[PDB]
Design a protein around this ligand. Structure first.
Ligand SMILES: Cc1cc2nc3c(=O)[nH]c(=O)nc-3n(C[C@H](O)[C@H](O)[C@H](O)COP(=O)(O)O)c2cc1C
Ligand code: SF4
Ligand code: SF4
Ligand code: SF4
Ligand code: FES
Ligand code: FES
Ligand SMILES: [K+]
Lengths: 214, 45, 263, 432
């Protein structure tokens, strides 16, 4: 529903048990030290992201706990969590399925990919599987537009997707095998399918085209 | 050592972890010089 | 010596450098329409109604934030500015709820009055309006958040004149809502002042809620006695009864605010 | 004296020789390809020479602005004022059709950090905050690996490249937003608050990140900055039309046989670029219906304009559009133009930060109206109403997102109004 008002529930309550592991704590202080002294509030976005990693989804306790360590008032922490899309204020199921639906990737029939996921999973767009393995939602442009329709499984890009190719990806996740990041075609990253129309010569060594002066 | 233009040697991103970005950021902290101080400890303090 | 010179509607005006366009226009007497810009609070720019045309300049500038410089002719009543004001208000009234007969701000609503002066006489918005769930922030403040225009005046007041940071804006886009996320009463000795700064009926007073209309009350100046500060107030009386105690302006004693125990 | 037949660049002058990841993207490969070479001499030349050679290069902002990058970077030639000086590299790449920033980061990151290093020296900055978008986690980790390699090699850090300068690069990840691509919003999001853009009576050169001076620069612009220093502005100025120099990347996507990326010389014919690098429009060039020149913000142009138009700033400006980010999206005759544009407005509505009224309410209103247009449930008078609405939000918003969302509607209306008329008539007689 993407509602922006948190109502207290037994699952998501300010008393929900959450904290930071000691390894997470040293990561947090390294994050804060990246920013100038006196403006440690700048670490809100990365630190709040850290709470996401060790919890999957951040409850209100995680957003409160971020406020205490960073001295930021909880209201400002709540603003960041609701504004940015990645922060999952509601629990998600293991592998997060993000499908591009913007025009450049839809022009190459991205809905076929979305339909293929819908058929294999059986879960309608938006909800989560009963075994909490896949969470299928649609997302806007993710950069890789020159590549064919793609997904954003957890933290991996799977480009040049094709309706049967994503069937292989889904069962690999169902069996625990990790699909290889990258396009599911002959193209490696972004090169033309037919062949390299440029950069077909060894790059020139140091000093090439370098003026006398510098 | 050829002009192996048919190989995508950038495969290191495959075997990455959930904490990889923050991990090597922590290891990278010692190189960073001391940050400037704005005086007060916080804009509210 | 530092005073730079500007031309408000052509007439020369002496302005301290760093003065915003809006204050320069006020020097002549023209009051630029505004929603977000409150004099005491900071300047934000969400209002977008303070837009005005600077002469020989293609882009309409926001008078609430632009500092003037040498030789500027602030064309307040230029056609481009008037088209800008009508456009901005059209967006404001696009999703506003039809609550004027039942809204306490009726008769003293800045959105209502600025619609009469700087705004169109109809609507071309044949869509479905938005609705936002109400929030509770205490037994003092009426909160009909569907009428809010996200001027962030309440947010600025809470974080500047009140000191407590519990009012904010959650979400992005048109679905952005101003409130407190987790349910919590906005309680402070200056809490009731958010009723005054809010230009619409989104935040009104529960005790007085829909018991009188602004055009029918008689305003009588007086001095508060609840505290020793002696804040100047405007006691509004109708038919020999007391409904509202509104703050007055003194710029020394109470600025533009009163305590809740006063109100 | 004039290379009128602009285009068909050769591999020698290409900047990102490791664009497709066909060579070692670590420090060893980058130095092999010609990176981190005589960097100290660039540092010792002095910031004035770095700025001066950028003006000679005529480099324009390759991020959607096209500003005279030399003039912009000259804004911190002012003396010190106690406050620290900071540099910021934009790496959000949230505009649809834009993929160039992703490729340089994950295939030639060492050029980027060197770009921050020479860029910071020219502008006197203390550190560079590369704001990579949150989705590019693998790219960010790849970027940090290069940073660690540079730190160990002594190129960056205390006494950077053995030149006395102390420069650091913090790569800050995003949390998911297209508005974070905006410079002032990016400055805002770095500070930790909501990613709403800030008004500019002030400018990042004076007030910026943490209040200190800053300058948001695109990844491509900073990446090519060191090579400009090595090869000179004269070498860079040789390519491209006047005021249109450089070798801007191109992200071709849509209804093409092989959508791809190529670093082609600027002011290239649009037909030529699609034919060879991309492979031509699916179903032949005659199957083309419309093309997005430089991303969603840039208005579309029909095939008639597509017949002969040079891919640059000025040539597209007189073609009722803009270069933007050089994100060429083609749309064949099998493409529902109205549906495609409605999706773009849907993307903009889902990405507007909601701060200013015209972008908060106008884009949502334009989304609802365009949705009716796709179904045809409207009247011909609504087309004119959509035109007026798009103009009302144009130039009245805090950031250029409102103008970035109004332009596609203006582009669609002025080039495909008969298509809109036919659909509404089709809806009318069907529902009789
Ligand atoms: C909505 C919006 C999104 C933008 N996204 C980006 C972006 O992803 N990358 C970028 O380099 N510039 C982006 N820009 C442009 C920046 O605001 C800014 O003009 C530019 O980054 C400055 O660097 P440049 O001169 O090298 O282009 C965006 C602007 C707007 C209004
Ligand atoms: S706030 Fe103003 S416009 Fe809205 S219902 Fe009340 S009187 Fe009418
Ligand atoms: S509740 Fe009132 S003061 Fe607060 S943002 Fe909305 S209109 Fe402004
Ligand atoms: S145009 Fe949209 S994104 Fe930009 S400041 Fe205004 S509301 Fe925010
Ligand atoms: S278009 Fe599908 S990711 Fe941008
Ligand atoms: S008064 Fe300047 S924007 Fe509202
Ligand atoms: K009010």
């Amino acid at each position: 529903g993407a509602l922006f008002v948190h109502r207290d529930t037994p699952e998501n309550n300010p008393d929900t048990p959450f904290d930071f592991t000691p390894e997470n704590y040293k990561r947090i202080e390294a994050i804060v030290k990246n920013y100038p002294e006196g403006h440690k509030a700048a670490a809100v976005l990365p630190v709040l992201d850290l709470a996401q990693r060790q919890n999957g989804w951040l409850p209100i306790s995680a957003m409160n706990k971020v406020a205490e360590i960073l001295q930021v008032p909880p209201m400002r922490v709540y603003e960041v969590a609701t504004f940015y899309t990645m922060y999952n204020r509601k629990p998600v199921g293991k592998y997060h399925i993000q499908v591009c639906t913007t025009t450049p990737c839809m022009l190459r029939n991205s809905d076929s990919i979305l339909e293929a996921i819908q058929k294999k999973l059986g879960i309608k767009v938006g909800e989560t599987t009963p075994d909490k393995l896949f969470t299928l939602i649609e997302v806007e442009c993710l950069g890789a537009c020159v590549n064919a329709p793609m997904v954003q499984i957890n933290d991996n890009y799977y480009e040049d997707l094709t309706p049967k190719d994503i069937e292989e990806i889904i069962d690999e996740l169902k069996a625990g095998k990790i699909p290889k990041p990258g396009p599911r075609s002959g193209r490696f990253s972004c090169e033309p399918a037919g062949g390299l129309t440029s950069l077909t010569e060894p790059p020139k060594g140091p000093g090439f085209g370098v003026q006398a002066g510098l | 050592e050829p002009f192996d233009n048919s190989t995508y040697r950038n495969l290191q991103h495959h075997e990455y972890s959930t904490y990889t970005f923050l991990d090597l950021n922590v290891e990278l902290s010692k190189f960073r010089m001391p940050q400037p101080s704005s005086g007060r400890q916080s804009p509210r303090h | 010596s530092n005073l730079i010179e500007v031309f408000v509607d052509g007439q020369s005006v002496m302005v301290e450098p760093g003065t915003t366009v809006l204050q320069a226009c006020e020097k002549v007497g023209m009051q630029i329409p505004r929603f977000c810009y409150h004099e005491r609070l900071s300047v934000a720019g969400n209002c977008r109604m303070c837009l005005v045309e600077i002469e020989k300049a293609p882009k309409v500038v926001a008078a609430c934030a632009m500092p003037v410089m040498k030789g500027w002719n602030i064309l307040t009543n230029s056609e481009k500015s008037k088209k800008a004001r009508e456009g901005v208000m059209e967006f404001l009234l696009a999703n506003h709820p039809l609550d004027c007969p039942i809204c306490d701000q009726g008769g003293e609503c800045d959105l209502q009055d600025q619609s009469m002066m700087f705004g169109s006489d109809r609507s071309r918005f044949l869509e479905g309006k938005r609705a936002v769930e109400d929030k509770n922030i205490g037994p003092l403040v009426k909160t009909i958040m569907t009428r809010c225009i996200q001027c962030t005046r309440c947010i600025r007041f809470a974080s500047e004149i009140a000191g407590v940071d519990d009012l904010g804006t959650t979400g992005r886009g048109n679905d952005m809502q101003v409130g407190t996320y987790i349910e919590k009463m906005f309680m402070s000795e200056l809490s009731g002042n958010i009723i005054d700064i809010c230009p619409v009926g989104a935040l009104t007073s529960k005790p007085y809620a829909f018991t009188a209309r602004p055009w029918e009350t008689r305003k009588t100046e007086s001095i508060d006695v609840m505290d020793a500060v002696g804040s100047n107030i405007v006691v509004s009386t109708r038919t020999g009864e007391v409904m509202r105690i509104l703050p007055r302006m003194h710029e020394d004693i109470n600025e533009e605010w009163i305590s809740d125990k006063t109100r | 004296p004039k290379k009128t037949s602009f285009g068909s660049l050769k591999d020698e002058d290409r900047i990102f020789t490791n664009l497709y990841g066909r060579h070692d993207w670590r420090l060893k490969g980058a130095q092999s390809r010609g990176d981190w070479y005589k960097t100290k001499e660039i540092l010792l030349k002095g910031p004035d020479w770095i700025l001066g050679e950028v003006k000679t290069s005529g480099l324009r902002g390759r991020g959607g602005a096209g500003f005279p990058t030399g003039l912009k970077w000259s804004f911190m030639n002012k003396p010190s004022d106690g406050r620290p000086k900071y540099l910021v590299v934009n790496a959000d790449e949230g505009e649809p059709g834009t993929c160039k920033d992703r490729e340089i980061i994950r295939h030639d990151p060492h050029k980027l950090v060197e770009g921050c290093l020479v860029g910071g020296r020219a502008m006197g900055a203390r550190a560079a905050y590369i704001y990579i978008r949150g989705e590019f986690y693998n790219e960010a980790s790849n970027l940090q690996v290069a940073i660690r390699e540079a730190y160990e090699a002594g190129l960056i850090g205390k006494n950077a490249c053995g030149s006395g300068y102390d420069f650091d690069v913090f790569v800050v990840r995003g949390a998911g937003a297209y508005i974070c691509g905006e410079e002032t919003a990016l400055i805002e999001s770095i500070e930790g608050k909501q990613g709403k853009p800030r008004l500019k009576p002030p400018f990042p050169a004076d007030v910026g990140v943490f209040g200190c001076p800053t300058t948001v620069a695109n990844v491509e612009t900073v990446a090519v900055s060191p090579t400009i220093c090595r090869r000179g502005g004269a070498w860079f100025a040789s390519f491209g039309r006047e005021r249109n120099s450089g070798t801007k990347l191109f992200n071709i996507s849509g209804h093409v046989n092989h959508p791809c990326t190529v670093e082609e010389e600027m002011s290239v014919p649009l037909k030529e670029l699609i034919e060879k690098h991309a492979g031509g429009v699916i179903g032949g060039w005659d199957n083309l219906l419309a093309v997005i020149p430089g991303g969603s913000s840039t208005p579309l142009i029909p095939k008639s304009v597509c017949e002969t138009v040079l891919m640059d700033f000025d040539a597209l400006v007189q073609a009722q559009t803009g270069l933007g980010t050089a994100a060429v999206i083609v749309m064949d005759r099998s493409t529902d133009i109205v549906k495609a544009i409605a999706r773009l407005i849907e993307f903009y509505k889902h990405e507007s930060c909601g701060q200013c009224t015209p972008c908060r309410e106008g884009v949502d209103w334009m989304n609802k109206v365009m949705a009716r247009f796709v179904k045809g449930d409207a009247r011909p008078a609504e087309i004119d109403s959509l035109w007026e609405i798009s103009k009302q939000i144009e130039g009245h918003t805090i950031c250029a997102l409102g103008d970035g969302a109004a332009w596609p509607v203006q582009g669609l209306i002025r080039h495909f109004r008969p298509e809109l008329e036919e659909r509404m008539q089709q809806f009318a007689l069907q529902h009789q």
